[PDB]
Amino acid sequence: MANGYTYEDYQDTAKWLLSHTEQRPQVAVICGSGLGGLVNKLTQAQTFDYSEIPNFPESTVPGHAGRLVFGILNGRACVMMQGRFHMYEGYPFWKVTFPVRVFRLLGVETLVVTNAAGGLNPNFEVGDIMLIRDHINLPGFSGENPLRGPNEERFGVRFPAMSDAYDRDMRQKAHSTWKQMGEQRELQEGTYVMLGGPNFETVAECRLLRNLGADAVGMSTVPEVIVARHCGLRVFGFSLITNKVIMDTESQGKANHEEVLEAGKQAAQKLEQFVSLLMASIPV
Amino acid sequence: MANGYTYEDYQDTAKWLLSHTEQRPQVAVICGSGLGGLVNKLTQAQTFDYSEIPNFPESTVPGHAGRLVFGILNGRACVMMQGRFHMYEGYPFWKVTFPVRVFRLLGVETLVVTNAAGGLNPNFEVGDIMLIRDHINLPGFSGENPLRGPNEERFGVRFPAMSDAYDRDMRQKAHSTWKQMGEQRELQEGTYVMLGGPNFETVAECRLLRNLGADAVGMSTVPEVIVARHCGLRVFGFSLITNKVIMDTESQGKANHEEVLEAGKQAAQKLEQFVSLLMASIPV
Amino acid sequence: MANGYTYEDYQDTAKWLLSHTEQRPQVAVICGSGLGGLVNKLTQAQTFDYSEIPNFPESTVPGHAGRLVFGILNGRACVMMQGRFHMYEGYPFWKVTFPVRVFRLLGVETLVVTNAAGGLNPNFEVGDIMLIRDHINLPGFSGENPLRGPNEERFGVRFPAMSDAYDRDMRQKAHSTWKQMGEQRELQEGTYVMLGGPNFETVAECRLLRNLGADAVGMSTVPEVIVARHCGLRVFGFSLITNKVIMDTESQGKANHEEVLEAGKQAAQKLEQFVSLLMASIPV
Ligand SMILES: O=P(O)(O)O[C@H]1O[C@H](CO)[C@@H](O)[C@H]1O
Ligand SMILES: O=P(O)(O)O[C@H]1O[C@H](CO)[C@@H](O)[C@H]1O
Ligand SMILES: O=P(O)(O)O[C@H]1O[C@H](CO)[C@@H](O)[C@H]1O
Ligand code: HPA
Ligand code: HPA
Ligand code: HPA
């Protein structure tokens, strides 16, 4: 069955949030695996567990708290998803992307998406931050898309373009901000490739993904960007490179979830600082 | 759930059509986006809205009228689908391909498939006509296939071959016919790649598709060709190159549905003329 | 709907088998198309039709008998699936992989997977045996995965690694064993790529698969390996190259199911002999 949410379901949820907080966010942030710490910088924060918000799904993955937090971050009013949804949990893309449309109805204009990703580009090192300049939607190639089914004209057009999904102006700002931080390592930039999961990749799959032109691999984000662009939200996002993908059969180890979470904590002070500074000029 | 249509459902629909028209078509034509004008050349035409034919799905995409038209085209009796179905509308492939099997039961022997496609091959120009010599079925790689589920032996075999899907003899005829038209631009020929949609591709996805060896990209056709070959229909098809795919991050624009429809009208007199001439020697 | 089997369903089926046979297998073998002959070497064999075992699905593909056979093979106690399940039959991956988890609950420690595959590597010849050193899971790229949905902690972790799926020690043993057989043709080794089916590939698709780095193509195995590794089973497998994939538009023929079955019978005495010898040192 295609999207089971009607336009009214989104507004009902939006009305409920508006009726339970005085906060009116302009920016929305989605926190990935081991990135839930970004919420700690919010002032005047109000938290809502996903389970208490009508129509909201629930995050079942370790490293995803499952809480919507409103607050002020470096002067800008924003709402953060401390934990997100993935298709490997059993969620159809229309459930995975529910919050994005609700955000649009709350008056939000900018969406910031983050995630933990495996590094495909050889020049990447664990701990690197990669600005997502583009993506490759593998599930979309087969028809698995959050927009499949009747189009809701109240959100956007039937055939939205994706060539300009990641805002160019925001990416320039990200680079200027990084230089101001005095970081020794350069801010990376590249293409993110999404696949279903939940298992980690084989050596053969990784070589293929790299040869397709991808720099980092992950199991989320893309469906949210698609829905976000469909409804006209400005999108900006980045991947925290938590591990280097195994490219040789002499497997000197293998990817594991705790290592990615561990990496998130490791890069906590850096990402939070970066996101906090980025708030200045979103624009508005 | 796999195919919900039983063999009797196809014949019931076929019987209904046979009982409402004296026309006995030997050729079936499926019109894509902005190609609905091909019907205007039919003599003794009888139209049936998809909504009035038992078991028939409905086209919901602008540029797809949703009408089955019987008529005589340049001496040959044929039936045309003015508008088709796509998986991005919410239709499973077994619904998308319903008409093809009904055509087989009407006595049809040849299927002509057309579509509007984005150009991947650098040598293609907007307005070009590309004969489809082969295809790449991305959704099929993952199991999304109109033949998934119990095989109906009354239509074809369990494991049909696809290496000879596009009739070689028809393609030669197409070239000889094109030369007779006195066209300045050459008739192109290549591989069509199908993906789910409904969103348009990212730059990264386009570079990948081109590197996979594809010449044009679209969101239909392949599932119909598969079912058509399974039941033994001779298949011939072509893509109208409506736009050049964006391959560089310096996006000097972006794909949109109206531009493709606009292109269809632009190439109306040419395609109609070409299809009309092709009717001579289908064979029979 | 994600996995419809609860942990108790697997154990119920395991208890039933334990209550109907004195055999306690340590190795499990899954026989592919035209490979059902491997069962003929079992001593003290007890057969169960899939239809009589609670919760077990049924094989509907010619070349798949649909019987679970317990027996002694060259000193080792094992259970064989004479015929397997495929997604193209209409089965979700959670149904396709049901037997693997039951095997784990029977006390099995090693899983041997076999299949008939089309050859992509130019150096392969019909009749060749290719040890699977790795795989590429196309359906998995889109989210079609037997592990999708809530993770059952009693079987394995949420994010299992796959880089070491095919046991290195078993592959070395396979090579030493092959040399002892006095075979003139070398034992091949490579990457297996799985796609949905049931139709055979186009020339364009084959060139693409080869360029992705695949050596053989097939419509099964991978989902079983994934579930097997998730629950900690040692995995070993091989493909019987039944035909050479058509890579040129001058199609001097085309793939067909009987040719693959015919090839299986052709290589019967060789594979059976090889599997029988491999039983020595699984280990235990
Ligand atoms: O994309 P986020 O939400 O960071 O989760 C990333 O981390 C997991 C692997 O450790 C996978 O779920 C992957 O998608
Ligand atoms: O393939 P047809 O029916 O031409 O439609 C083509 O046109 C649309 C894009 O403008 C997409 O639906 C694509 O598939
Ligand atoms: O993989 P097994 O079970 O060998 O079956 C192989 O043989 C069939 C083609 O002849 C396809 O189903 C393919 O997957
Ligand atoms: O190695 C990985 N693979 C896929 N997704 C990931 N997210 C973090 N690391 C990985
Ligand atoms: O750019 C395109 N992409 C996919 N399908 C299309 N059909 C016409 N143009 C396009
Ligand atoms: O040519 C083939 N293609 C896909 N699967 C196969 N299994 C045996 N031969 C083939």
What would the two tokens of residue C69 be?
């056979």
Which chain C residues touch B151 with a CB distance below 8 Å? 198
Is B142 designated active site? no
Which chain C residues touch B158 with a CB distance below 8 Å? 61-62, 198, 257
Tell me if the bond preceding A62 is cis, omega within 30° of 0.
Answer: no
Are B160 and C199 inside 8 Å of each other by CB?
yes
Burial A172-186 (b: 16+ CB within 10 A, else e): ebbeebbeeeeeeee
Q: Which residues pair with C133 in a beta bridge?
A: none
> How far apart, in Å, are the Cα atoms of B36 and each of A5, A159, B71, B188?
33, 19, 14, 22
Cα C265 to its chain centre, rounded Å, is 17
Task: Go through chain B and tell me how many residues it has.
Answer: 284
Q: What is the CA radius of gyration of chain C?
A: 18
Instruction: Identify from B85, B93, B205, B260 which residue to disrupt to test chain A contact, counting A C-beta atoms within 10 A and taking the largest count.
Output: B205
Question: In a 3-state reduction of DSSP, which class is residue C252?
Answer: coil
Write the DSSP string, B8-49. HHHHHHHHHHHTT-S---SEEEEE-TT-GGGGGG-EEEEEEE
How far apart CA C180 and CA A128 sit, in angstroms, is: 50
What would the two tokens of residue C151 be?
């993770």
User: What is the number of other CB atoms lying within 10 angstroms of the CB of residue A75?
Assistant: 9
How far apart CA C245 and CA B163 sit, in angstroms, is: 10
Task: Go through chain A and tell me how many residues it has.
Answer: 284
* Helices assigned H by DSSP within chain B: 7-18, 93-96, 98-106, 138-141, 168-180, 203-211, 222-230, 257-266, 268-278
What would the two tokens of residue A152 be?
């809701």
CA dihedral of residues C252, C255, C257, C262 (deg, nearest 10) = 60
Write a three-state SS string for A45-63.
EEEEEHHHCCCCCCCCCCC
How far apart CA A221 and CA A18 sit, in angstroms, is: 26
How far apart CA C4 and CA C160 sit, in angstroms, is: 21
Element (H, E) at A27: strand A27-31
Cα A186 to its chain centre, rounded Å, is 21
- Closest by CA to C242, choosing from C134, C120, C136, is C120
Q: Which residues pair with C112 in a beta bridge?
A: C29, C236
* Helices assigned H by DSSP within C37-92: none
- DSSP symbol at A145: -
Chains near C with 3+ CB pairs less than 8 A apart are A, B
How far apart CA C222 and CA C225 sit, in angstroms, is: 5
User: What is the number of other CB atoms lying within 10 angstroms of the CB of residue B176?
Assistant: 10
Q: Would you say A131 and A187 are in contact if contact means Cβ atoms under 8 Å apart?
A: yes
Main-chain phi, psi angles of B93, to 5 degrees? -60, -25
What would the two tokens of residue A52 be?
């208490």
Q: Would you say B241 and B132 are in contact if contact means Cβ atoms under 8 Å apart?
A: no
Q: What is the CA radius of gyration of chain B?
A: 18
- Closest by CA to B174, choosing from B164, B162, B189, is B189
Q: Would you say B199 and A203 are in contact if contact means Cβ atoms under 8 Å apart?
A: no
How far apart CA C101 and CA C80 sit, in angstroms, is: 14
Are C197 and B145 inside 8 Å of each other by CB?
yes
Q: Would you say A84 and A32 are in contact if contact means Cβ atoms under 8 Å apart?
A: yes
- Closest by CA to A31, choosing from A283, A271, A279, A227, is A271
How far apart CA A140 and CA A225 sit, in angstroms, is: 12
Cα B21 to its chain centre, rounded Å, is 24
- Closest by CA to C142, choosing from A202, A223, A226, is A223
Which residue puts its alpha carbon closest to atom 7 of ligand 4? Answer: A117
Which runs of E-coded beta strand occur in chain C? 27-31, 43-49, 67-73, 76-82, 110-119, 129-137, 188-194, 216-218, 234-244
Please report the resolution in angstroms: 2.0
Q: Would you say B102 and A106 are in contact if contact means Cβ atoms under 8 Å apart?
A: no
- DSSP symbol at B125: -
Q: Would you say B57 and B91 are in contact if contact means Cβ atoms under 8 Å apart?
A: yes
How far apart CA B81 and CA B103 sit, in angstroms, is: 11
Q: Would you say B112 and C108 are in contact if contact means Cβ atoms under 8 Å apart?
A: no
Q: Would you say A116 and A218 are in contact if contact means Cβ atoms under 8 Å apart?
A: yes
Residues with CB under 6 A from ligand 4: A 116-118, 200-201, 217-219, 242-243, 245, 255, 260
How far apart CA A47 and CA B105 sit, in angstroms, is: 62
How far apart CA B265 and CA C40 sit, in angstroms, is: 66
- DSSP symbol at B83: S
* Helices assigned H by DSSP within C49-165: 93-96, 98-106, 138-141
Fold held by C1-284 = Rossmann fold (3.40.50)
Q: Would you say A24 and A52 are in contact if contact means Cβ atoms under 8 Å apart?
A: no
Please name the amino acid found at residue B234.
R
How far apart CA A271 and CA A274 sit, in angstroms, is: 5
How far apart CA B132 and CA B112 sit, in angstroms, is: 11
Main-chain phi, psi angles of C153, to 5 degrees? -55, -20
Ligand nearest to the CA of C216: 6
Find the chain A residues whose C-beta atoms sit closer than 8 A to any C-beta of B.
Answer: 2, 133-137, 140-145, 147-151, 157-165, 191, 212-214, 226, 230
Which chain A residues touch C140 with a CB distance below 8 Å? 195-197, 199
> How far apart, in Å, are the Cα atoms of B119 and each of A41, A207, B83, B276?
48, 27, 21, 25
- DSSP symbol at C125: -
Cβ burial, residue A171 (10 Å; 0-12/13-18/19+): middle
Cα A60 to its chain centre, rounded Å, is 16
Cβ burial, residue C179 (10 Å; 0-12/13-18/19+): exposed
Q: Would you say A138 and A226 are in contact if contact means Cβ atoms under 8 Å apart?
A: no
Distance A201 CA to ligand 1 centre (A): 13
How far apart CA B22 and CA B25 sit, in angstroms, is: 10
Tokens 């300009």 map to which residue? A164
User: What is the number of other CB atoms lying within 10 angstroms of the CB of residue B1?
Assistant: 7
Q: What is the CA radius of gyration of chain A?
A: 18
Are B196 and A165 inside 8 Å of each other by CB?
no
Please name the amino acid found at residue B70.
F
How far apart CA A202 and CA A118 sit, in angstroms, is: 12
The contacts of residue C111 (CB under 8 Å, 6+ apart) are: C27, C28, C29, C30, C100, C103, C224, C225, C228, C233, C234, C235, C236
- Closest by CA to A280, choosing from A67, A78, A136, is A78
Separation in Å, CA of B158 to nearest CA in chain C: 7
Write the DSSP string, C138-197. HHHHTT--TT-SS--TTT--SS---TT-B-HHHHHHHHHHHHHTT-SSPPEEEEEEE---
How far apart CA C147 and CA C271 sit, in angstroms, is: 31
Please name the amino acid found at residue A30.
I
Cβ burial, residue B45 (10 Å; 0-12/13-18/19+): middle
Q: Would you say A215 and C178 are in contact if contact means Cβ atoms under 8 Å apart?
A: no
User: What is the number of other CB atoms lying within 10 angstroms of the CB of residue C201?
Assistant: 26
Q: What's the number of CA atoms in the CB half-sphere (13 Å) around residue A11? A: 5
